[PDB]
Amino acid sequence: SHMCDAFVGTWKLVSSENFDDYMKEVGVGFATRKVAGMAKPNMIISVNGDVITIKSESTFKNTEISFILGQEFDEVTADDRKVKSTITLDGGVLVHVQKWDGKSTTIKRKREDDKLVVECVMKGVTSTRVYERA
Ligand SMILES: c1ccc(-c2c3c(nc([C@H]4CCCO4)c2-c2nnn[nH]2)CCCCC3)cc1
């Protein structure tokens, strides 16, 4: 067992707050905002050894990242940004920082009750998205 075990599973989006504004701050264009905002992704998290895999599956796009905590990787996001990412575990929270074009955003995934609570922050705008077990 590892602390990271509480994140493993299939998680379905059940609520979203402020995601459109967050996407505006990120620089996402109108059509992508509308279609991506409409999606109801599943977040599938698994662990094999030191490698964590996070998949997002939806009608819009399917994405998959695999990584080792603290080891930077190149990621293409669902909106087609080419970013350099690092994910660490800080006090039980998975903290994902993405850097591109002199910009940064942070995505924090936390287990709270039976939910996965995901907070995304860009330049003072936060979005909160809540996922429940599928
Ligand atoms: C369908 C819809 C949205 C996404 C997505 C996107 C972004 N950020 C996330 C953040 C939210 C919290 C977990 O990642 C998700 C996401 N939402 N759920 N899974 N992935 C970046 C902003 C532009 C739009 C793409 C992926 C597929």
From Swiss-Prot:
Compartments, as annotated in UniProt: Cytoplasm; Nucleus
Positions carrying Phosphoserine: 15
GO cellular component: cytoplasm; cytosol; extracellular exosome; lipid droplet; nucleus
Residues the record lists as binding a fatty acid: 129-131
PROSITE patterns recorded: FABP
Xref: CDD domains: FABP4
Residues bearing PTM Phosphotyrosine: 22
UniProt GO MF annotations: fatty acid binding; hormone receptor binding; long-chain fatty acid binding; long-chain fatty acid transmembrane transporter activity
InterPro entries documented for this protein: Calycin, Fatty_acid-bd, ILBP, Lipocln_cytosolic_FA-bd_dom
GO annotation terms (biological process): brown fat cell differentiation; cellular response to lithium ion; cellular response to tumor necrosis factor; cholesterol homeostasis; fatty acid transport; long-chain fatty acid transport; negative regulation of DNA-templated transcription; positive regulation of cold-induced thermogenesis
Pfam families per UniProt: Lipocalin
Keyword terms: Acetylation, Cytoplasm, Lipid-binding, Nucleus, Phosphoprotein, Transport
Motif Nuclear localization signal, residue range(s) on this chain: 24-34
N-acetylcysteine sites (modified residues): 4
Protein family: Belongs to the calycin superfamily. Fatty-acid binding protein (FABP) family.
Function in brief: Lipid transport protein in adipocytes. Binds both long chain fatty acids and retinoic acid. Delivers long-chain fatty acids and retinoic acid to their cognate receptors in the nucleus.
Domain notes: Forms a beta-barrel structure that accommodates hydrophobic ligands in its interior.
Subunit field text: Monomer. Homodimer. Interacts with PPARG.
Name of the featured protein: Fatty acid-binding protein, adipocyte
Lineage: Eukaryota, Metazoa, Chordata, Craniata, Vertebrata
